[PDB]
Design a protein around this ligand. Structure first.
Ligand SMILES: CCC1=C(C)/C(=C/C2=NC(=C\c3[nH]c(/C=C4\NC(=O)[C@H](C)[C@H]4CC)c(C)c3CCC(=O)O)/C(CCC(=O)O)=C2C)NC1=O
Ligand SMILES: CCC1=C(C)/C(=C/C2=NC(=C\c3[nH]c(/C=C4\NC(=O)[C@H](C)[C@H]4CC)c(C)c3CCC(=O)O)/C(CCC(=O)O)=C2C)NC1=O
Ligand SMILES: CCC1=C(C)/C(=C/C2=NC(=C\c3[nH]c(/C=C4\NC(=O)[C@H](C)[C@H]4CC)c(C)c3CCC(=O)O)/C(CCC(=O)O)=C2C)NC1=O
Ligand SMILES: CCC1=C(C)/C(=C/C2=NC(=C\c3[nH]c(/C=C4\NC(=O)[C@H](C)[C@H]4CC)c(C)c3CCC(=O)O)/C(CCC(=O)O)=C2C)NC1=O
Ligand SMILES: CCC1=C(C)/C(=C/C2=NC(=C\c3[nH]c(/C=C4\NC(=O)[C@H](C)[C@H]4CC)c(C)c3CCC(=O)O)/C(CCC(=O)O)=C2C)NC1=O
Ligand SMILES: CCC1=C(C)/C(=C/C2=NC(=C\c3[nH]c(/C=C4\NC(=O)[C@H](C)[C@H]4CC)c(C)c3CCC(=O)O)/C(CCC(=O)O)=C2C)NC1=O
Ligand SMILES: CCC1=C(C)/C(=C/C2=NC(=C\c3[nH]c(/C=C4\NC(=O)[C@H](C)[C@H]4CC)c(C)c3CCC(=O)O)/C(CCC(=O)O)=C2C)NC1=O
Lengths: 144, 160, 145, 161, 41, 160, 160, 161, 161, 160, 161
């Protein structure tokens, strides 16, 4: 509805579709709807855009070329370098987890059962381990 | 265009065009002949405008055309005016389309990376465009000069 | 004449949580009278409570509800123990009384301090001549709530 | 706490600067509004009780709040609530005289949000009680002082929400 | 360890560690500009 | 200030300001421009005032600037005038505030302990302040010189 | 440092450190004494390095100290050398730690955005850094000059 | 969020009232200024970067703020600060188009005062950065739009202080 | 986080100072103990499990703590407790390598006291579990490293009490 | 001087000087040593004042040192600062004379015509003198800087 | 708190052991150094003020710390800082007499790191103030007592870092 925030879904082919248009056509309208999806990924995962060195290209290049989905572009961003750094590293371990959950699955944790699942996965596997559960849950897939 | 933009939003939400979207197509198409006249006048004076804008760019930025300047020399200056000719052309396209789709894919997306490589000072390209606005705008009626001016200020905006 | 000064610096530490001598301040006028016997340690402690130095330090930077909690730790040496006890004290600091003599009557801060000091409990444990001390773990039976 | 004038003095003291032109201009901007602040305080003080009564009447009572199950049910809690109201009015009058909101933070807002959460005191309803007193105040004090009184009521209410 | 009358002392706030006027005296240098022009000529 | 002092007494007795308290705020604020002028004049002559206090001091106490003196030497004297510059600054603050709150927290509470540690003779600091009164007071009209003088005599008083 | 980098990678994996992140630390400790010495040497000649860097820079790029140049004028040049002093300092920090770490946070992350705002030509800042390499490197033994040179070339790299 | 028009619709909806003469007059007062709001937004957007640079130059840099010990020392923090500046400019442009400050509360001010207290970000210095961008904006947009743009910069700055 | 070396760099950076003699002496005092820190970490890491086992045996189990009603009753909670123990050991090993306790604050102590109060986790019993692991560690690492390892266990334990 | 201006009034009315006229000569001459000190300080820093004035001027208006600018080039610039050196000199003369007689006959009567002929913006030029005042006002202690400043502001006043 | 004589008793009491040969040897190792501890305390106490003065002079004042913007700027804060210094000196003298650091934890270090973080008090600068007083102390007390006094100053300073 209009009572909540917009949801961006990349339906626009992308895929580097091609056509029956001039071979080196200058304008290709929808090759710019992907681009707004790309910036909107950043705006959920980190909350703002990154600075120049920081952006992760070569993840975008592939999304834009149609080789990987939206789902996997989020995974690359989630398991990235600055994401770790900004949000994992400087905080107490469970503060890191609670905050990371809001960014990757849009809501706060409900429980201690849930919180603990990750707290005891982070102690064996690290940042990487924790990220990969939020990303691999059943709930991620049903919802997103 | 206005058409492309309206439709893409329609198709992406799986729906027919809105009353609003239909209205803007109607207002847009009514301005067709006028927009075509604005492009003609500017196409007809393209030399005058590009040269003049170069004299004024090189007055506010005398060093671009100086020892350590990107446009220093006769053929580094020739390419610079050619780029000014490119952008005036794209501005005529934008005016007849009623939005930037074409202007954008052809000459702003990727422009930072292109000019950074060539080491061209971007903000002085933005000045060259303001200079063209000033010249072009002096060859158009008040109403048409404003309508043209929006597209000049867009390019100035995108190089930023 | 040094016993007195052992005692008068104990009061600074009990009421202000540390001696004010190092920085250099003191409640001077009041202070002399305690040494010379006109006013008791009870009157000396009450003059320090309504002084300009304690108002600045323990009243100004906090809220009325936080002023009640710190007053119990300075004039009784223990934490508030009941919710019933908050409403007695919170509504004592909260109302104007009026001004009666030179003034500073039922104050906000002033009223709260008399109320503590004139309480039954205060003048029992430390009644009259002793400077208040923390009644923490070794000293009394501590509540666990 | 600090007022307009000590806000400036302490901002310069930490830099060890004598007051310069920019500082002196700020202090003038306070002094030049000073007489009006005083008149406004005398109106609020002397109408204190009527402001609370009209603010409660527009924003609190004749409602579920005053009925069984409501937080201002019982003479005890009704008394506590209008007691609070008097605090707000009185301190906002201090803030407006001082021309600085710092006292509203130090002696009113600090911990108050959680205190109200812990007792169950309805925050949104309390804000309406603040913004109703502002409405009354702005009528009583007149053109001269209306905007200046108003801001410290608005400071109070965005401090809770 | 000597006289009182070193009382000529400037009283400003001294520059911070990267002000634009610590490298000011080196900023007048060795080009062809307004600081290149020989004064007595 | 006068404001802070009035209010703190008000809040501590849980009450609105008195007619008296309101009156003094009114008289105080009326003297605003005058008080600001007094601070300006003295700020404008700070370097002169510091040097004439410093001469008056070393005549009256040549010992402080002598073998076993706290201010003996060129840089033990430099710090001494800097302290005199500090106190003149605080005096300008006090005059514009209309009381000592600021002067007090910044430079008298703790001053005995500070200077005792450094082994600075306190009463000769009080003399340096009298010396500044004498100079500053000669740059102000009779009425403004008195108003300033109260704040100088306060500092002299607090170092005691 | 080398320590910080090794550890952060260790903790991310949540396992104690491993063989090859210990050997590097040992190398760094031996290196650190030499590294500390190089930084001290660089620190001693800072004013000479900056000044001679600044001459080398303005010959190679006179356009920045010209009418439409970011560093045109006596101050605009004073701030420019101050920035060169900043980066030499960060280079001494990088050398001593054994890892670039802190320099990145202090002076490259955000540097594009800072200088774009100020309109400073980034690639001529990179030249100023090469110029400092040349001077600094002439005050160090062959082996120490190379070790220093890596950190100069990093900064040159990051402004890119 | 809400704009001029939805502010009126929701104020009437809670009373279940069809729009009456007073409502219709308010909406007209918005529509009649609408074209001017659009032109002003196009000036701000297209001069965004220059406004920040001139505002920083007058009110932030060449100072202790940018020196060691200062909050906008380090390229990291300098970048964060002018990033913030862009937010303010951009949102004020939204508020002015909408003719309603509600978006400045919902998406900018809420919690920001305490966020800045928690990081140490100097509030007074940030306000000057806001009021300098306003100064620049008011020149660029002209008589038509100057007062209308200005108010949402003033909304922002009294929201922090 | 920071280590010995970055502690010094950041302390000078805020003053914008090149490293001077006092700084250089501090860094030497770290480098000169560095090889010993590494050897000590390799002993702790490779005896990790045995240190926890011997520390639990001296300070936790065979007690009311492991019996019904005790906080380390249930395989779930016993597992959580020795999991915690491994954190402490591992991070103390980081702090000792870094020669700086800052990581123990940033990633271990912050909020932990209240977290334990909220779950009911016995603080005094946890401290004994820390000071027992220290005892074991100090035997295993030898004269070279005993005092240096020990301090970060002591940092941990006065951080809870 | 004050003498020249005043005696002239005496001779024109065929009379000896008035008590008033005698009094002002006395007050004037008492203010001599100070005026001489103000001229000395500024004479002593002339080269600094001129150049820093010249930088302040070209920032506030550079175009004059650009292709179509009156002061474009090394020897067209050697003349603009020389004119700034001329006016600072006349300002020192005025300060020691206590009026403008000398300043006026030497460098304002006939100027405006003079500048106009050459086509120099007169307001460009008054910036430059106003800029010279700043550099110079800063090599003097607060009392002497004001006394000097009156003569700088006079020239700024006359040129317009 | 505990001291060497007391610690030996409580360490054995928890094991329910009579004092045995190992215990008796420890207590002897304390008693045999006792007279020297007393003499050292009398030197420190009677030179207290001079030690602080010389320690501040070498490690705190004549610096940015005492200048505007510095934490020991203002007579108030200068007084608070050397007040603190006296605590450290005095308690270290207690620890050294007791031959046990436990009092330094119970009554000085507990919460102090965070207290200093909360006020902004510079930790590294405070450590230098501690290690400068140690330097002075070690000269005044002589060969007999130098090492024994020194350790409790070192206990204090690694307790903050
Ligand atoms: C000097 C600054 C200061 C303030 C502002 C303050 C507020 C405050 N309000 C309180 C309770 C309360 N506050 C209210 C307020 C209200 N009830 C409603 O339904 C309305 C929404 C609202 C009035 C508009 C009520 C009903 C209670 C009683 C809660 C209880 O029964 O425990 C209490 C608990 C102690 C007590 O009951 O007195 C405090 C401390 N205390 C202070 O020291
Ligand atoms: C169980 C404890 C308890 C009591 C008693 C109580 C009384 C109470 N009486 C009220 C009003 C009122 N009460 C009265 C009563 C009277 N008028 C007169 O002249 C007579 C003297 C008197 C009748 C005998 C009137 C006239 C009002 C309306 C006043 C107004 O609206 O301004 C209101 C405000 C309206 C509301 O929101 O309910 C409350 C809360 N509330 C409580 O929680
Ligand atoms: C330690 C990390 C760090 C750096 C590097 C830094 C640089 C920095 N350079 C600045 C200006 C400047 N920097 C330069 C530098 C140059 N001009 C040129 O053309 C050359 C390419 C270059 C010299 C090699 C110039 C000319 C200015 C003045 C620009 C202006 O005022 O608009 C300013 C604004 C002035 C100020 O307030 O200090 C900052 C903050 N700040 C930092 O915190
Ligand atoms: C109700 C849930 C629950 C269980 C089951 C539990 C088991 C448990 N078994 C323990 C030890 C032990 N358990 C065993 C058991 C065995 N040895 C063998 O080889 C066999 C495979 C097995 C017997 C069938 C042994 C030998 C120890 C002593 C190990 C040691 O001290 O190192 C201990 C540590 C000693 C103590 O403090 O009590 C616990 C807590 N604790 C619990 O809270
Ligand atoms: C990376 C830094 C880090 C630490 C240190 C940490 C501690 C920590 N300990 C926890 C629980 C716990 N901690 C203990 C610890 C003990 N039980 C005892 O009786 C002993 C006294 C003590 C072991 C010596 C126990 C039993 C629980 C479970 C409480 C429950 O049942 O909910 C929890 C709650 C979530 C969970 O259950 O995993 C956290 C976050 N978390 C972190 O992120
Ligand atoms: C704004 C509040 C404030 C004041 C006033 C202040 C004073 C102050 N005076 C100092 C030294 C000093 N102050 C003096 C002053 C004097 N010597 C004499 O004999 C005369 C009596 C007197 C001059 C009138 C001297 C000689 C020293 C050097 C003492 C030393 O280095 O041992 C120092 C230590 C040096 C430093 O680090 O700055 C401080 C902090 N600090 C403050 O924060
Ligand atoms: C009995 C054991 C004990 C200790 C040790 C103790 C320390 C302590 N130091 C404090 C403040 C302080 N501590 C300092 C210390 C310093 N300033 C500097 O710049 C230096 C680095 C350093 C001196 C070497 C300062 C300046 C303050 C005042 C902070 C403020 O202005 O609020 C405070 C806050 C309350 C107060 O201001 O008195 C405490 C409790 N309290 C105790 O009960």
């Amino acid at each position: 509805t209009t009572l909540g925030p917009k949801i961006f879904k990349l339906t626009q082919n992308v895929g580097f579709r091609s056509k029956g248009m001039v071979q080196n056509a200058g304008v290709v309208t929808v090759e710019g709807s992907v681009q707004a999806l790309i910036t909107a990924a950043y705006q959920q995962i980190f909350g703002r855009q990154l600075y120049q060195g920081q952006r992760l290209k070569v993840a975008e290049i592939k999304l834009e070329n149609g080789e990987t989905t939206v789902k996997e572009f989020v995974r690359a961003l989630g398991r990235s370098e600055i994401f770790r750094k900004l949000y994992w590293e400087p905080f107490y371990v469970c503060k890191a987890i609670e905050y990371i959950h809001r960014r990757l699955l849009g809501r706060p944790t409900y429980d201690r059962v849930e919180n603990n699942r990750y707290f005891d996965i982070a102690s064996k596997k690290g940042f990487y381990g924790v990220v990969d559960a939020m990303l691999n849950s059943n709930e991620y897939q049903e919802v997103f | 265009s206005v058409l492309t933009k309206a439709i893409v939003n329609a198709d992406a939400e799986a729906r027919y065009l809105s009353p609003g979207e239909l209205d803007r197509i109607k207002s847009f198409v009514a301005s067709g002949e006028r927009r075509l006249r604005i492009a003609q006048t500017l196409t007809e004076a393209r030399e005058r405008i590009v040269k003049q804008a170069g004299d004024q760019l090189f007055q506010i930025r005398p060093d671009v055309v100086s020892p350590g300047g990107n446009a220093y020399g006769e053929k580094m200056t020739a390419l610079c005016l050619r780029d000014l000719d490119y952008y005036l052309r794209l501005v005529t396209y934008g005016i007849v389309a009623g939005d930037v789709t074409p202007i954008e894919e052809i000459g702003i997306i990727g422009v930072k990376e292109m000019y950074n490589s060539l080491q061209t000072p971007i903000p002085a390209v933005a000045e060259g465009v303001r200079a063209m606005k000033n010249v072009a705008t002096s060859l158009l009626s008040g109403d048409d000069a404003a309508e043209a001016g929006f597209y000049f200020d867009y390019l100035v905006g995108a190089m930023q | 004449s040094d016993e007195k000064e052992r005692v008068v610096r104990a009061a600074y530490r009990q009421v202000f949580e540390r001696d004010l001598k190092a920085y250099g301040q003191s409640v001077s006028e009041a202070e002399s009278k305690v040494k010379n016997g006109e006013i008791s340690v009870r009157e000396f402690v009450r003059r320090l409570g309504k002084s300009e130095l304690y108002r600045r330090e323990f009243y100004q930077p906090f809220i009325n509800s936080r002023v009640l909690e710190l007053a119990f730790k300075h004039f009784l040496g223990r934490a508030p123990e009941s919710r019933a006890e908050v409403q007695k004290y919170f509504s004592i600091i909260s109302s104007p009384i009026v001004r009666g003599q030179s003034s500073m009557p039922s104050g906000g801060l002033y009223a709260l301090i008399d109320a503590l000091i004139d309480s039954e409990e205060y003048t029992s444990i430390f009644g009259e001549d002793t400077v208040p001390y923390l009644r923490n773990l070794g000293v009394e039976a501590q509540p666990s709530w | 706490m600090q007022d307009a004038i000590t806000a400036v003095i302490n901002n310069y003291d930490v830099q060890g600067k004598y007051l310069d032109g920019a500082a002196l201009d700020k202090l003038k901007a306070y002094f030049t509004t000073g007489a009006v602040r005083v008149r406004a305080a005398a109106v609020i003080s002397s109408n204190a009780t009527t402001i609370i009564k009209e603010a409660a009447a527009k924003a609190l009572i004749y409602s579920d709040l005053t009925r069984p199950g409501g937080n201002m049910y019982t003479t005890r809690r009704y008394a506590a609530c209008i007691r609070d109201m008097d605090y707000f009015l009185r301190y906002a009058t201090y803030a407006m005289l001082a021309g600085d909101p710092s006292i509203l933070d130090e002696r009113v807002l600090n911990g108050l949000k959680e205190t109200y959460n812990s007792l169950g005191v309805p925050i949104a309803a309390t804000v309406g009680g603040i913004q109703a007193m502002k409405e009354v105040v702005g009528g009583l004090v007149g053109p001269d002082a209306a905007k200046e009184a108003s801001i410290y009521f608005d400071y109070l209410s965005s401090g809770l929400s | 360890r000597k006289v009182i009358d070193s009382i000529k002392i400037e009283d400003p706030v001294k520059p911070g560690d990267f002000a634009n006027f610590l490298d000011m005296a080196r900023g007048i240098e060795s080009r062809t500009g307004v600081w290149s022009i020989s004064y007595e000529s």
